[PDB]
Amino acid sequence: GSDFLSPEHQRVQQRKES
Ligand SMILES: *NCCCCCCCC
Numbered sequence: 001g002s003d004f005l006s007p008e009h010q011r012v013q014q015r016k017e018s
Pocket residue numbers: 002003004005006007008009010
């Protein structure tokens with residue numbers, strides 16, 4: 001179904017690497 005795709009990442013409230 002509807003998806004952009006990636007083998008990585010998670011929509012956390014913050015980022016400190018990406
Ligand atoms: N269609 C959303 C799920 C797949 C992409 C986002 C998570 C990838 C680790």
